[PDB]
Enzyme design. Sequence first.
Site, PDB file in Angstrom:
ATOM      1  N   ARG A 163     -11.341  -1.818 -21.613  1.00  0.00           N
ATOM      2  CA  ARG A 163     -11.954  -0.513 -21.382  1.00  0.00           C
ATOM      3  C   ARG A 163     -12.181   0.201 -22.713  1.00  0.00           C
ATOM      4  O   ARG A 163     -13.189   0.872 -22.888  1.00  0.00           O
ATOM      5  CB  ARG A 163     -11.111   0.375 -20.460  1.00  0.00           C
ATOM      6  CG  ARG A 163     -11.145  -0.019 -18.986  1.00  0.00           C
ATOM      7  CD  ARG A 163     -10.292   0.853 -18.081  1.00  0.00           C
ATOM      8  NE  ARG A 163     -10.399   0.440 -16.684  1.00  0.00           N
ATOM      9  CZ  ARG A 163      -9.386   0.176 -15.857  1.00  0.00           C
ATOM     10  NH1 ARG A 163      -8.129   0.233 -16.265  1.00  0.00           N
ATOM     11  NH2 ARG A 163      -9.646  -0.128 -14.599  1.00  0.00           N
ATOM     12  N   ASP A 204      -6.803  -2.556 -20.322  1.00  0.00           N
ATOM     13  CA  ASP A 204      -6.871  -1.277 -21.015  1.00  0.00           C
ATOM     14  C   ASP A 204      -7.650  -1.429 -22.324  1.00  0.00           C
ATOM     15  O   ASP A 204      -8.471  -0.564 -22.660  1.00  0.00           O
ATOM     16  CB  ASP A 204      -5.477  -0.719 -21.302  1.00  0.00           C
ATOM     17  CG  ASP A 204      -4.529  -0.659 -20.117  1.00  0.00           C
ATOM     18  OD1 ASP A 204      -4.219  -1.737 -19.536  1.00  0.00           O
ATOM     19  OD2 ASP A 204      -4.085   0.463 -19.796  1.00  0.00           O
ATOM     20  N   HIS A 246       0.822  -0.725 -19.694  1.00  0.00           N
ATOM     21  CA  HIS A 246      -0.390  -0.534 -18.912  1.00  0.00           C
ATOM     22  C   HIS A 246      -0.447   0.906 -18.407  1.00  0.00           C
ATOM     23  O   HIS A 246       0.556   1.432 -17.913  1.00  0.00           O
ATOM     24  CB  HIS A 246      -0.444  -1.496 -17.717  1.00  0.00           C
ATOM     25  CG  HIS A 246      -1.656  -1.306 -16.846  1.00  0.00           C
ATOM     26  ND1 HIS A 246      -2.939  -1.474 -17.300  1.00  0.00           N
ATOM     27  CD2 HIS A 246      -1.760  -0.889 -15.549  1.00  0.00           C
ATOM     28  CE1 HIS A 246      -3.792  -1.219 -16.304  1.00  0.00           C
ATOM     29  NE2 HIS A 246      -3.087  -0.830 -15.210  1.00  0.00           N
ATOM     30  N   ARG A 302       0.854  -1.190   0.000  1.00  0.00           N
ATOM     31  CA  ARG A 302       0.000   0.000   0.000  1.00  0.00           C
ATOM     32  C   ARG A 302       0.889   1.239   0.000  1.00  0.00           C
ATOM     33  O   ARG A 302       1.758   1.325   0.870  1.00  0.00           O
ATOM     34  CB  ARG A 302      -0.880   0.081   1.253  1.00  0.00           C
ATOM     35  CG  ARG A 302      -1.941  -0.996   1.371  1.00  0.00           C
ATOM     36  CD  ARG A 302      -3.156  -0.762   0.498  1.00  0.00           C
ATOM     37  NE  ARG A 302      -4.095  -1.852   0.711  1.00  0.00           N
ATOM     38  CZ  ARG A 302      -5.229  -1.764   1.396  1.00  0.00           C
ATOM     39  NH1 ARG A 302      -5.636  -0.596   1.859  1.00  0.00           N
ATOM     40  NH2 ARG A 302      -5.947  -2.851   1.623  1.00  0.00           N
ATOM     41  N   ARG A 354       6.805   7.093  -5.564  1.00  0.00           N
ATOM     42  CA  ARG A 354       6.478   6.036  -6.506  1.00  0.00           C
ATOM     43  C   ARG A 354       7.603   5.004  -6.551  1.00  0.00           C
ATOM     44  O   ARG A 354       7.360   3.794  -6.472  1.00  0.00           O
ATOM     45  CB  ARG A 354       6.299   6.604  -7.925  1.00  0.00           C
ATOM     46  CG  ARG A 354       4.859   6.831  -8.364  1.00  0.00           C
ATOM     47  CD  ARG A 354       4.035   5.561  -8.546  1.00  0.00           C
ATOM     48  NE  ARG A 354       2.724   5.808  -9.148  1.00  0.00           N
ATOM     49  CZ  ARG A 354       2.522   6.156 -10.419  1.00  0.00           C
ATOM     50  NH1 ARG A 354       3.529   6.230 -11.272  1.00  0.00           N
ATOM     51  NH2 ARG A 354       1.301   6.426 -10.842  1.00  0.00           N
ATOM     52  N   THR A 369      -9.614  -0.306  -8.097  1.00  0.00           N
ATOM     53  CA  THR A 369     -10.359  -1.084  -9.089  1.00  0.00           C
ATOM     54  C   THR A 369     -10.170  -2.585  -8.821  1.00  0.00           C
ATOM     55  O   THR A 369      -9.113  -2.996  -8.332  1.00  0.00           O
ATOM     56  CB  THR A 369      -9.963  -0.714 -10.528  1.00  0.00           C
ATOM     57  OG1 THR A 369      -8.828  -1.485 -10.938  1.00  0.00           O
ATOM     58  CG2 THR A 369      -9.662   0.760 -10.691  1.00  0.00           C
TER      59      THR A 369
END
Lengths: 331, 331, 331, 331
Positions: free
Chosen positions: A168, A165, A192, A98, A105, A247
């Site tokens: 979508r 992707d 991605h 998490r 990053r 998601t």
Amino acid sequence: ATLKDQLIYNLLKEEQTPQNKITVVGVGAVGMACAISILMKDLADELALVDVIEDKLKGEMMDLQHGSLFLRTPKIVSGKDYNVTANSKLVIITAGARQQEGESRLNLVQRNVNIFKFIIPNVVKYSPNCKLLIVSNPVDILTYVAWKISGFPKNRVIGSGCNLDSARFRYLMGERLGVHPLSCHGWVLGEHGDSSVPVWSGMNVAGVSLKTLHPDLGTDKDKEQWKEVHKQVVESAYEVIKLKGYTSWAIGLSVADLAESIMKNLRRVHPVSTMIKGLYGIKDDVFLSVPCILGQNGISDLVKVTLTSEEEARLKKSADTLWGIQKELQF
Amino acid sequence: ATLKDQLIYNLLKEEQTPQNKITVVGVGAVGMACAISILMKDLADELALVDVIEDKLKGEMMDLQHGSLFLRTPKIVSGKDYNVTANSKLVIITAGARQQEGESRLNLVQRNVNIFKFIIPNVVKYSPNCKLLIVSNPVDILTYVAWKISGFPKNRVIGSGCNLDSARFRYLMGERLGVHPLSCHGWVLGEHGDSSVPVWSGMNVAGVSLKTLHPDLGTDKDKEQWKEVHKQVVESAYEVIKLKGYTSWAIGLSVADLAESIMKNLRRVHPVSTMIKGLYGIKDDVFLSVPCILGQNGISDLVKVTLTSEEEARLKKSADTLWGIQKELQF
Amino acid sequence: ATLKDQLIYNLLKEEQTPQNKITVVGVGAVGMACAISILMKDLADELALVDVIEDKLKGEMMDLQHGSLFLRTPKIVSGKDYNVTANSKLVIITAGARQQEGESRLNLVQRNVNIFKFIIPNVVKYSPNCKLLIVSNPVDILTYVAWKISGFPKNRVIGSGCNLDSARFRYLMGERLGVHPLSCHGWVLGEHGDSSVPVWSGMNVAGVSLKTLHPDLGTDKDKEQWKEVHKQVVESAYEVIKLKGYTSWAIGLSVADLAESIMKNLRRVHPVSTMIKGLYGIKDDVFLSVPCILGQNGISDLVKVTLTSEEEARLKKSADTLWGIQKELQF
Amino acid sequence: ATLKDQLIYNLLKEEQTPQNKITVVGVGAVGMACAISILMKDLADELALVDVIEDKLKGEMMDLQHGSLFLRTPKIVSGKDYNVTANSKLVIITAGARQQEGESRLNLVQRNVNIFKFIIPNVVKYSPNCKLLIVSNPVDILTYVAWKISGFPKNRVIGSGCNLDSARFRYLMGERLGVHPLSCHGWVLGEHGDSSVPVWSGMNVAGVSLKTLHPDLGTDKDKEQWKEVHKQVVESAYEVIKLKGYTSWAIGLSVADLAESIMKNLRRVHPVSTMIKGLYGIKDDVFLSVPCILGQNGISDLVKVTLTSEEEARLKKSADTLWGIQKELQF
Ligand SMILES: NC(=O)C1=CN([C@@H]2O[C@H](COP(=O)(O)OP(=O)(O)OC[C@H]3O[C@@H](n4cnc5c(N)ncnc54)[C@H](O)[C@@H]3O)[C@@H](O)[C@H]2O)C=CC1
Ligand SMILES: NC(=O)C1=CN([C@@H]2O[C@H](COP(=O)(O)OP(=O)(O)OC[C@H]3O[C@@H](n4cnc5c(N)ncnc54)[C@H](O)[C@@H]3O)[C@@H](O)[C@H]2O)C=CC1
Ligand SMILES: NC(=O)C1=CN([C@@H]2O[C@H](COP(=O)(O)OP(=O)(O)OC[C@H]3O[C@@H](n4cnc5c(N)ncnc54)[C@H](O)[C@@H]3O)[C@@H](O)[C@H]2O)C=CC1
Ligand SMILES: NC(=O)C1=CN([C@@H]2O[C@H](COP(=O)(O)OP(=O)(O)OC[C@H]3O[C@@H](n4cnc5c(N)ncnc54)[C@H](O)[C@@H]3O)[C@@H](O)[C@H]2O)C=CC1
Ligand SMILES: NS(=O)(=O)c1ccc(Cc2c(-c3ccc(F)cc3)nn(-c3nc(C(=O)O)cs3)c2CC2CC2)cc1F
Ligand SMILES: NS(=O)(=O)c1ccc(Cc2c(-c3ccc(F)cc3)nn(-c3nc(C(=O)O)cs3)c2CC2CC2)cc1F
Ligand SMILES: NS(=O)(=O)c1ccc(Cc2c(-c3ccc(F)cc3)nn(-c3nc(C(=O)O)cs3)c2CC2CC2)cc1F
Ligand SMILES: NS(=O)(=O)c1ccc(Cc2c(-c3ccc(F)cc3)nn(-c3nc(C(=O)O)cs3)c2CC2CC2)cc1F
């Protein structure tokens, strides 16, 4: 003797290996979405769950077990020890850290790399012939990492990549056209997420090139702003994360789809992350999504899509970015 | 004109009603588990989601929509306004309050009643011919409440009841016997949860009464402690709640099972919560689980199970408890 | 090079062994009903067909192949040569002769035995580890014959037996009760067909014994003539043969059900034909249907049904009939 | 009272209208292939069968009914009288004659027309709101005939058309490429069978035009002879007819695919036979296959494929052929 022994005569004590076994490592929302999608598509005869959080793991396992009456997967098991994963055909990695407040990053990426350093050797010990399907982000980098740690040939290390992707994209395209996404064809390749590449030239319904009907398709000049469809492929993910926090459902279904192709040896074509050195002009050891033929030995073949100069440059830029990140990572 | 108009000739502008529409009200973990289970069993041509938390609702809706490529339910919609629920065949209520620290059970029950006072009239306005399937706890009381508020005949108001409890029982029985739960038969009736009644006399495999093989079955004297199976039906739910915080998967699958019977008019028998006044010795307007025949008009028929004196007394005790709680509630 | 090689880069030049292969021997109506049912439940990654009639075989194979788009079984093959059957997990025998003018049933039985003498050694050569599922009639006798010729242990030689008969029973019981057959429980055991034994005491809905509600259940004097249900289990098969010339669809579905339990290792209980010497009072080497636990290693366990003296006598009578026929057959 | 009444308390004494009913008229091999495919994809809550041969009809109906345990279609009915078809959403016509000695194909066409003159008015009386799906050959002509006799708007009269032909094409293309037909895209349009038109320019994998990679695609001189793929779409059907006597399985699956799109309102695109006057340059009232959006109101939209001059000429030629036959037919 017992009621069991009064009711049931046992002949056969032969041991039995699982024949169609799948493991999910990491039972967060993504891992559980993968698990339920797999269970409800009857892709496995045994499902194994692994996490480091033992209580969560056990509780999730028991909850699925309580629905066994409604399922056709007779064995659901779990543990922190990887012996529960033995003899898996397919191992799906959805394990992740998490992000903490004030964490870079890059630190998070490295924390995920370190998780993989513990996971991958353990998976390989117990299932040396498995296919590895990497879902954890950053997925293209972590697929490379899984490849390097596992020592597996590149056909058996697959990143979910742009399968979601592209799903979508076909969803959004279908909304604009009033057609089911199944009948709407279009490919998002490369990385991605943000840097993904929509291949405008392959966008079609019923074999009809949208680009040939509408030459401005994919350009800034487009009156109809079809670029917005790809922009929404990116932003819709950020939107879902903002609205519900994460998601899970879409990725779970997409992973079940890839699993179906592998487990049933379908040789369908999916945009997944594969070791792309030597193709599409790329010269470094990096993983990017291209259309791959998926079956029982993982990626057996890939489709060579004809790219514009611009599309190709975007892939090479991605490859340079990934190589740069890969060398500043630790293993 | 547009690319759409160049690609697609539209003849037909006729409106179209949804023909096999299901609504889920309350998109917490239970509601979403119900939604995904329904989506993956192709039970609906339209799924509507409702909640009061608009962001969560929208994000969940979009996440499912992104998996449309992998589904055969062409229309997924959501909103806080109940016009999205119009013309539903089946409306599943999984809406609930969260217990606060220092909150009584009774206060929580009443908070759930008040949620139902807002939900049920709105559902009825937009789907006057629907079946109501109540999942929210306390499920037996809230099924009675939904019945009273809706004004529906009792065949169209169904509580999930002991469908899940019975599924857990068959799961546990299967573990002890080495048989799939499908081939293990046994009924838990009465109240969902702690006060549920295992009907020992119907417990069988292949038509073979376990009680006749093993007369101590269900007693304290039992060397093999088969009562422990029912105890575990109760404790296993508490165990899952302790380990992962809640239960979702098992209930989701069980609700999808009931939905299948209703939507496809199967006339299968399930232990669900029905208005039981005038049967099994009960004299008050209360809902308890008995084996009910489920199809397109809800509960058309119920099975009259032969109970021991003790089993019957336990049901009447339950009915007295429910009547007492019902009259100290506000509506 | 080729368009294939321009479109597709090959990674992996490997043979690929089938992982979930099923063979059907005999592509008459029953064989093809089995084939289509198996294909539409996605039980196999490869289906192999065998017959002696080459044209019919090839044409049937091609007809299925043309439906590949609509299936998830990527490889369908056929041949006269059994090398096409190599490495099958499950081999289903639906091969048989047609009764000629002036030919006794016993003469026909011997012709079917002789067919098995050719088939079984060939099946065994190419799939030494398969389970054999015998459908051809007389099914109980030919299951014994397959066992003797194959040399397989008894867990791996299974006759379709009374799985179909029991399905008919539950169908008819459902018609009388207005309940789905799934919720109507009842067992037909012993020989497929005329001499089958309905076990009245196991007939139930929701664990409620019909026999206890209605003590005349299974007697000739019954006001409600419930024996007619079993009589119709027998006569309904003769009726379909009379009206259509043969039966195919129900047996196809029954065999797919058994195949599901085996291929997915479900450990469900089915009344199938098993080598029953030493149980139910039987003292000769014969196959009769009793409730068996089915999974990936065939028959793993038997349920010990409590029979009346009369029910047991009927099974022993069947065993004596089968033993007598088996001894007067030539092999 | 009765055992039923002792076991079961009836709540609701109601007629029950079917909600998802499908009728198959003509229970030869094609009709029953359609029936079994529909039953095993759970597309209907009621299936009705019609034929003129009463014994065959009844026997087929009973054979399916005996498999009810294994299906989720609770009501299967049959009759000579069309009252059994009442309130069907979808009616599939697979009825036809057999060519006699000395009989031209055109004579046979007229006999099939005369069959439709009896069938269609009867279907319409009892299901005035149904969609008609015509399978009987000559399918394009008989779809026109069904349209004219029924008086239905053109969205509700659909010929199975080139859905099967296109499935064959994608099968053959997959054999050449080593890819699943699902991932091989290509359209056969126009008339079912001999005069069908392969649209070379739409042939693709992963959005990669084969025509652009291989410009000789669809020419006679092609090194790789890709025209043979289309030739085999035609010849493979003749081959199955020659080897087995008829085709059934592939068409059954193709029809189930169309039925799925209609019954579940999927809005997928299929090449089916539609009243095409005013489009693709056609000026007479004929039915030809073009890519149509299929859903609950039948054909809602057409995709406008960009054709070469030659492709368009072939469609117009087909339209002229059909118009000529239609005028010399008697009704
Ligand atoms: N490739 C794609 O298209 C997408 C991938 N994802 C990724 O999936 C990953 C998982 O996502 P969420 O479930 O939302 O996260 P999560 O944080 O809820 O779950 C991660 C799970 O991994 C487990 N874990 C951590 N270290 C572990 C170890 N050494 N061994 C086993 N388990 C370990 C955690 O204990 C935790 O249960 C994330 O990296 C996320 O970005 C998310 C959606 C789409
Ligand atoms: N009958 C059974 O066998 C079982 C039923 N349950 C019950 O299911 C209920 C839901 O469970 P969870 O998802 O875990 O709870 P949750 O608290 O996560 O979700 C409840 C949802 O209801 C919504 N809600 C509250 N008021 C609303 C209103 N007026 N309208 C629409 N939505 C409203 C919340 O906003 C929330 O998203 C609970 O009462 C729980 O006890 C849980 C498992 C088994
Ligand atoms: N166990 C059960 O409940 C049921 C069993 N059956 C049995 O299924 C059998 C097949 O039934 P149908 O399809 O109606 O008969 P059929 O005569 O149409 O098909 C039998 C097929 O066996 C093939 N065959 C014959 N010798 C062979 C050999 N040496 N190798 C390979 N194939 C060979 C034939 O060429 C033929 O294609 C029959 O014995 C029938 O009684 C059918 C009804 C239900
Ligand atoms: N559209 C396509 O791609 C394909 C269409 N077909 C067509 O399907 C049709 C049926 O094929 P098969 O089953 O092989 O033929 P079949 O001759 O075995 O079955 C036809 C059935 O039509 C019934 N019938 C005749 N007149 C009737 C009436 N007035 N009412 C109700 N039923 C009636 C017959 O009694 C018979 O049972 C044929 O025209 C065949 O060419 C088959 C292959 C594929
Ligand atoms: N080519 S790569 O391996 O280097 C690479 C770099 C960066 C990212 C960004 C990223 C991360 C991410 C999480 C953790 C990290 F430590 C780094 C990146 N997650 N993530 C998610 N996607 C979804 C979904 O539903 O699509 C849900 S979260 C995304 C995509 C973002 C939503 C558009 C992706 C990516 F592949
Ligand atoms: N007959 S009744 O309507 O009066 C009635 C009274 C009390 C309860 C207790 C109760 C509540 C409950 C939540 C909120 C309230 F305000 C009151 C009761 N939830 N709940 C859950 N069950 C599950 C699962 O997975 O089985 C998950 S939570 C349970 C059962 C407990 C786990 C054994 C149930 C019940 F039906
Ligand atoms: N226990 S056994 O192995 O010795 C044995 C002996 C005799 C028979 C009779 C028999 C034959 C039969 C065909 C050929 C022979 F050479 C001998 C018997 N077939 N057959 C079929 N059943 C069906 C269906 O749909 O149920 C279709 S045909 C039947 C059952 C009759 C319809 C009820 C069955 C049986 F198992
Ligand atoms: N456009 S049209 O309506 O005017 C028209 C005219 C002629 C035909 C020829 C035709 C006939 C036919 C049967 C009876 C008649 F009286 C006339 C034609 N049947 N039939 C079948 N196809 C199959 C299969 O599996 O594809 C099985 S039979 C075929 C196609 C041939 C195998 C490729 C088709 C067609 F659509």
